[PDB]
């Protein structure tokens, strides 16, 4: 016993409190019931546990024991409620896998010693088949209401054993230190806080503190994984807040390019176009103010928050005198980084509520194929849609002709996206997103699309030099704009009314003109080498 | 796990898709209780990269989502801004081709904020890349690196010589004295209790703690307390980690780390086999031995063992026998049939402890060269190994002695890191892995020996005659152990005679050792392999270190004798001690053999040369450097060999 001996905890408690602290890090339990502190119920994404702790006290755990009726009863014994059968008899309301585990601190003797070993590893070890007679004939071949057998419970029973109390403290201390490394990037100050997380998960568990410093529930008896998550977070944020560090939150990610007028679409609402016109200051079009606004898009691009946590651990003078060569080697490094940031925060600005950052690995023909700037949004009362995005920024010939190109390529793209049976590799890169079943049946590929084409969207930009937009202001660069990027947006048209070779999907487009894009690259070379 | 395994156990079937494999990485690396895992099946993706060669970029991004930052600048060329960006950030501040894991980068950060740092297991990642950032920060002034063993107290001196060459001056040797601001105290836990003047120290940092988790646990204890009394802040990197209480009680609030980052995929196969059992341990040997092609490290619990090993290798027609200069100066200067001249000459390495330095280097960068096959080492740590082996054949587990086991399952794949093993490893156990008073005794003795033989124990200069059974007699009760050790029986008094008239008479160690042989084949005929380790054993640490210490003690004991006595001769045994001390050269000159240059070499260089008396290590190197041309021209072609390796000149 350790600190849970110090505080008057029970072995019970202290499982409890490792199943949540194992619902901390493992990211696919959703819940972990718990009415009493020896009936842990923790649903996970495709089955369920059943947590019974048992303890005898005369020396082992023999059959006899996990087939004995409980008393239960003034002189009397209620039928079929041995220890076994409330193992059995523990109902599901969901059509989840069921799986049985008991949890004791003695150790099990030689007739039940086959349940020690984890499924996993029972497809040639002896012990099952005379274990299971030997059961069904004490129990007189038991079967539920649910038609569960005996051998349906040794096929799902892993029996654990915990040496001493101060065992499981360590491996939920274990667990806590650890995610709270791989949730927020952060070592906890000292043992007595990762102590005193654990402490306050067993008050939690049993009760026995105040409101204030206890995991919410909606309803007692059961706690969920996000209330679990946020209340970590307080604790490791208080930690950071008490150890003298600086709490690492997301930067205001300055709004590039404002969108132009309503957003104009076509009739039957699968294509969309959007135009994104910077306005002048002063006489002046405002080139820095667009290149410095997108070289402060230098991490949320390229790098991942768990890496861009690091980069706030850096010190001032360390973030200085580390990044001074330029990590571009080309015009045509620099030019690509900026048609993607540009992509990368309109879709964001288009969005009320942010997108997941995510990439997508696709086969062709057995070789790979890469596709950056994809996202996830959350629509909840339809689902979780997938943008895949393309950039472009066209400096060589006229757009007109060129946009036909460019969408015939993203037509190919596409149906190399949704047309296939192979599996797909969704790269979420947000460490914090639960990625449901809804986009986890189209990557597993293993079902045809039924329907699936309103998950998928296909977002792309296409910057270009307008003839319009000139470094002169010209007063009155608009009307004849709006109708240009009207006839611009009617190029993704002609196919939707003609045919229907992918009708069936909305694409968006992102047209926006510049008075010259080679200048605005020219600039963010320049910025990004100042840093 | 299931998805783990099976793509795990998918990589050796035939119908076996990279791009499966990949899905099942990044599902693992999604999950954070799974993460180590994906990076697991990452490394075997990095050991098979002919089956990746279609899926490239998948596998970079899922090694840089991984924190395999390392992996990602030495395994891939064709690297994007963004993977080139995240290596700047990690860049480690010394150098600009080295680069941080992420757990890594995580300890930097903490250690580089001033707080005191304890890991939760020697693992799989060197951290040589956390001390060289920390001296390369220009922040710290004075460090104390504590090493277990003198080789790598020496390799670690020249890591740090070869960055940090002027900034820092490093300290290694008793000799040596701080004339700089910035100093590197790269000591063992003896030589820092013998250092006077371990004071204001920076930061120190200490691996290999599971001694404090025998002539290893109190010293190491002892150099503790001195550092934590002395320093402020300090980096434990091993044992003595399941939630590390004491040092906080003490004043020292450290920031105990506890990580899963592993960098080294392993294959474990156990046989089993008790550990007396050697004739099925020895056909285990012969099987494994076939299994074996690659680069194989074999642990044993004795030199002894490893020969036996050695010999049963070539048994079986496995190495490849070759003979070089090397082979012809071992034999010409060691013995024919000894361990390591045999297992050289059939492309078998012997690497333990008790090794001259020079042959250590020798079978060490032989190993790393490819050259050689079954590199037989006797301890976890072998010094100037690289990152090449790609079996461990763990021979002997149960080294007994309290000693659980070697090799844990949570020490396996820090072990085999440390090991150096290439990514995939195989793990051949030949049995199961489990899991989890020295000042003051000599007077009471001296105060019965009576005024009749006090005449033996006042000598000057020049010793007199009958003084060897009396220091025999006060060595087989000082330090009983010591002797015993090295084959030497406590009683009769007699054979520790034979070893002192042997070294007395002896003009030169080569004429001692060849004597020492040739009497040992008499012995073992009433074998001459272990003959020669426990010589060596011998010479290097009873003459070198615990003999001459213990005739310094004796020496204040018999001033008060003979004060009480009414004795009047003078006390002095300059001419013993820094005899027995000086190996049978100048007094300063022995020191290089710690840099690895042969004892029997340095005598040719006393006698070619001019040696002076007062120098130190700094100032014999930097004349033999400067002499070269002198010796260069009229000595051997493996001694001078050995001296350019020794002294890092090059050609």
């Known amino acids: 016993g350790g600190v849970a001996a110090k505080h008057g905890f029970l072995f019970q408690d202290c499982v409890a409190a490792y199943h949540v602290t194992r619902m901390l890090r493992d990211k696919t339990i959703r819940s972990v019931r718990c009415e009493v502190t020896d009936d842990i119920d923790i649903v996970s994404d495709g089955y369920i546990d059943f947590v019974q702790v048992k303890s005898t006290g005369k020396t082992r755990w023999n059959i006899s024991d996990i087939v004995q009726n409980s008393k239960?009863?003034?002189?009397?014994?209620?039928?079929?409620?041995?220890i076994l059968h409330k193992s059995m008899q523990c109902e599901s309301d969901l059509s989840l896998g069921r799986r049985?585990?008991?949890?004791?601190?003695?150790?099990?003797?030689?007739?039940?010693?086959?349940?020690?070993?984890?499924?996993?590893?029972?497809?040639?070890?002896?012990?099952?088949?005379?274990?299971?007679?030997?059961?069904?004939?004490?129990?007189?071949?038991?079967?539920?209401?649910?038609?569960?057998?005996?051998?349906?419970?040794?096929?799902?029973?892993?029996?654990?054993?915990?040496?001493?109390?101060?065992?499981?403290?360590?491996?939920?201390?274990?667990?806590?230190?650890?995610?709270?490394?791989?949730?927020?990037?952060?070592?906890?100050?000292?043992?007595?806080?990762?102590?005193?997380?654990?402490?306050?998960?067993?008050?939690?568990?049993?009760?026995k503190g105040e409101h204030s410093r206890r995991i919410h529930s909606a309803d007692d008896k059961s706690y969920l994984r996000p209330d679990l998550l946020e209340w970590f977070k307080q604790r490791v944020e208080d930690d950071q807040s008490r150890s003298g560090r600086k709490i690492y939150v997301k930067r205001d990610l300055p709004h590039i390019l404002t969108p132009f007028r309503a957003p104009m679409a076509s009739v039957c609402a699968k294509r969309k176009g959007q135009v994104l016109h910077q306005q002048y200051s002063l006489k002046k079009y405002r080139y820095?103010?667009?290149?410095?606004?997108?070289?402060?898009?230098?991490?949320?691009?390229?790098?991942?928050?768990?890496?861009?946590?690091?980069?706030?651990?850096?010190?001032?003078?360390?973030?200085?005198?580390?990044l001074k060569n330029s990590v571009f080697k080309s015009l045509h490094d620099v030019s690509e980084f900026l048609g993607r940031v540009l992509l990368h925060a309109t879709i964001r600005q288009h969005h009320e509520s942010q997108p997941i950052p995510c990439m997508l690995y696709v086969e062709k023909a057995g070789a790979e194929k890469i596709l950056e700037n994809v996202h996830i949004v959350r629509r909840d009362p339809e689902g979780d849609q997938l943008w895949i995005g393309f950039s472009e920024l066209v400096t060589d010939i006229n757009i007109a002709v060129r946009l036909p190109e460019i969408r015939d390529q993203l037509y190919e793209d596409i149906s190399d996206c949704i047309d296939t049976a192979r599996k797909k590799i969704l790269d979420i890169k947000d460490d914090n997103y639960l990625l449901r079943h809804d986009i986890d049946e189209i990557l597993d590929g293993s079902q045809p699309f039924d329907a699936h084409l309103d998950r998928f969207t296909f977002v792309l930009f296409v910057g270009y030099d307008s003839n319009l937009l000139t470094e002169p202001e010209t007063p009155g660069f608009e009307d004849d704009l709006e109708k240009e990027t009207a006839v611009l947006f009617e190029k993704f048209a002609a196919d939707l009314i003609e045919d229907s070779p992918f009708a069936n999907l909305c694409i968006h487009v992102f047209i926006y003109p510049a008075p010259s894009l080679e200048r605005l690259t020219q600039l963010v070379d320049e910025k990004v080498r100042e840093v | 796990?299931?998805?783990?395994?099976?793509?795990?156990?998918?990589?050796?079937?035939?119908?076996?898709?990279?791009?499966?494999?990949?899905?099942?990485?990044?599902?693992?690396?999604?999950?954070?209780?799974?993460?180590?895992?994906?990076?697991?099946?990452?490394?075997?993706?990095?050991?098979?990269?002919?089956?990746?060669?279609?899926?490239?970029?998948?596998?970079?991004?899922?090694?840089?989502?991984?924190?395999?930052?390392?992996?990602?600048?030495?395994?891939?060329?064709?690297?994007?801004?963004?993977?080139?960006?995240?290596?700047?950030?990690?860049?480690?501040?010394?150098?600009?081709?080295?680069?941080?894991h992420s757990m890594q980068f995580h300890i930097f950060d903490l250690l580089k904020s001033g707080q005191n740092v304890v890991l939760?297991?020697?693992?799989?990642?060197?951290?040589?890349?956390?001390?060289?950032?920390?001296?390369?920060?220009?922040?710290?002034?004075?460090?104390?690196?504590?090493?277990?063993?003198?080789?790598?107290?020496?390799?670690?001196?020249?890591?740090?010589?070869?960055?940090?060459?002027?900034?820092?001056?490093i300290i290694h040797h008793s000799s040596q004295v701080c004339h700089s601001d910035q100093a590197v105290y790269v000591l063992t836990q003896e030589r820092v209790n013998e250092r006077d003047d371990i004071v204001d120290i920076d930061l120190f940092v200490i691996d290999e703690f599971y001694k404090l988790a025998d002539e290893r646990v109190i010293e190491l204890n002892i150099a503790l307390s001195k550092l934590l009394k002395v320093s402020r802040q300090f980096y434990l990197t091993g044992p003595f980690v399941n939630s590390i209480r004491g040092l906080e009680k003490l004043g020292y609030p450290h920031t105990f780390v506890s990580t899963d980052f592993n960098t080294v995929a392993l294959d474990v196969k156990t046989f089993g086999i008790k550990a007396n059992d050697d004739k099925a341990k020895l056909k285990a040997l012969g099987e494994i031995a076939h299994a074996c092609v690659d680069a194989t490290i074999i642990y044993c619990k004795s030199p002894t063992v490893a020969g036996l090993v050695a010999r049963e290798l070539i048994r079986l027609g496995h190495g490849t026998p070759t003979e070089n200069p090397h082979?012809?100066?071992?034999?010409?200067?060691?013995?024919?049939?000894?361990?390591?001249?045999?297992?050289?000459?059939?492309?078998?390495?012997?690497?333990?402890?008790?090794?001259?330095?020079?042959?250590?280097?020798?079978?060490?960068?032989?190993?790393?060269?490819?050259?050689?096959?079954?590199?037989?080492?006797?301890?976890?740590?072998?010094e100037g190994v690289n990152t090449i082996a790609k079996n461990v054949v763990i021979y002997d587990n149960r080294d007994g002695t309290r000693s659980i086991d070697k090799f844990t399952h949570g020490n396996i794949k820090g072990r085999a890191g440390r090991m150096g093993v290439h990514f995939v490893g195989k793990i051949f156990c030949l049995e199961e892995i489990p899991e989890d008073e020295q000042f003051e005794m000599l007077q009471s003795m001296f105060e019965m020996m009576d005024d009749n033989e006090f005449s033996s124990l006042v000598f000057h200069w020049t010793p007199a005659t009958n003084f060897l059974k009396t220091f025999a007699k006060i060595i087989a009760r000082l330090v009983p152990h010591t002797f015993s050790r090295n084959g030497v029986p406590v009683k009769p008094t007699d054979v520790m005679i034979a070893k002192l008239?042997?070294?007395?008479?002896?003009?030169?160690?080569?004429?001692?050792?060849?004597?020492?042989?040739?009497?040992?084949?008499?012995?073992?005929?009433?074998?001459?392999?272990?003959?020669?380790?426990?010589?060596?054993?011998?010479?290097?640490?009873?003459?070198?270190?615990?003999?001459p210490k213990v005739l310094s003690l004796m020496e204040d004991v018999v001033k008060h004798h003979a004060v009480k006595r009414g004795i009047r001769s003078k006390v002095d045994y300059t001419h013993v001690k820094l005899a027995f001390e000086s190996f049978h050269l100048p007094p300063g000159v022995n020191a290089l053999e710690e840099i690895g240059i042969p004892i029997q070499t340095l005598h040719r260089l006393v006698d070619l040369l001019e040696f002076s008396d007062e120098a130190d290590v700094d100032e014999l190197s930097q004349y033999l450097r400067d002499t070269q041309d002198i010796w260069s021209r009229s000595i051997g072609y493996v001694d001078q060999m050995f001296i350019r390796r020794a002294l890092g000149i090059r050609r």
């Open chain 1, 72 to 82: 239960g009863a003034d002189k009397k014994t209620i039928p079929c409620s041995s």
């Open chain 1, 100 to 207: 049985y585990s008991i949890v004791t601190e003695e150790k099990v003797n030689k007739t039940l010693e086959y349940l020690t070993i984890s499924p996993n590893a029972r497809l040639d070890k002896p012990g099952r088949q005379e274990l299971i007679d030997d059961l069904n004939k004490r129990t007189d071949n038991f079967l539920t209401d649910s038609g569960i057998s005996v051998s349906d419970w040794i096929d799902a029973a892993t029996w654990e054993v915990f040496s001493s109390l101060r065992e499981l403290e360590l491996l939920g201390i274990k667990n806590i230190r650890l995610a709270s490394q791989d949730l927020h990037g952060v070592i906890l100050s000292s043992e007595t806080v990762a102590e005193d997380i654990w402490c306050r998960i067993l008050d939690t568990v049993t009760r």
């Open chain 1, 288 to 322: 820095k103010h667009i290149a410095d606004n997108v070289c402060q898009w230098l991490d949320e691009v390229f790098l991942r928050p768990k890496e861009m946590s690091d980069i706030h651990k850096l010190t001032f003078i360390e973030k200085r005198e580390r």
């Open chain 2, 1 to 100: 796990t299931e998805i783990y395994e099976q793509a795990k156990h998918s990589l050796q079937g035939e119908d076996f898709s990279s791009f499966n494999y990949l899905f099942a990485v990044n599902k693992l690396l999604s999950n954070p209780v799974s993460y180590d895992l994906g990076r697991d099946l990452i490394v075997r993706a990095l050991d098979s990269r002919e089956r990746f060669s279609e899926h490239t970029t998948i596998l970079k991004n899922m090694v840089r989502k991984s924190g395999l930052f390392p992996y990602l600048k030495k395994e891939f060329t064709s690297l994007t801004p963004d993977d080139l960006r995240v290596l700047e950030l990690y860049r480690t501040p010394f150098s600009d081709g080295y680069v941080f």
């Open chain 2, 120 to 169: 939760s297991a020697p693992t799989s990642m060197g951290k040589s890349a956390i001390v060289d950032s920390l001296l390369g920060m220009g922040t710290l002034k004075r460090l104390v690196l504590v090493v277990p063993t003198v080789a790598l107290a020496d390799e670690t001196r020249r890591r740090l010589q070869e960055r940090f060459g002027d900034r820092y001056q």
């Open chain 2, 327 to 382: 082979v012809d100066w071992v034999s010409e200067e060691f013995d024919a049939d000894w361990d390591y001249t045999v297992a050289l000459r059939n492309g078998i390495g012997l690497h333990f402890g008790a090794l001259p330095r020079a042959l250590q280097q020798y079978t060490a960068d032989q190993f790393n060269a490819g050259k050689l096959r079954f590199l037989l080492c006797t301890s976890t740590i072998i």
């Open chain 2, 501 to 547: 008239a042997g070294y007395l008479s002896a003009e030169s160690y080569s004429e001692y050792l060849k004597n020492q042989i040739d009497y040992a084949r008499q012995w073992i005929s009433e074998t001459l392999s272990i003959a020669l380790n426990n010589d060596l054993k011998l010479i290097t640490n009873t003459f070198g270190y615990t003999l």
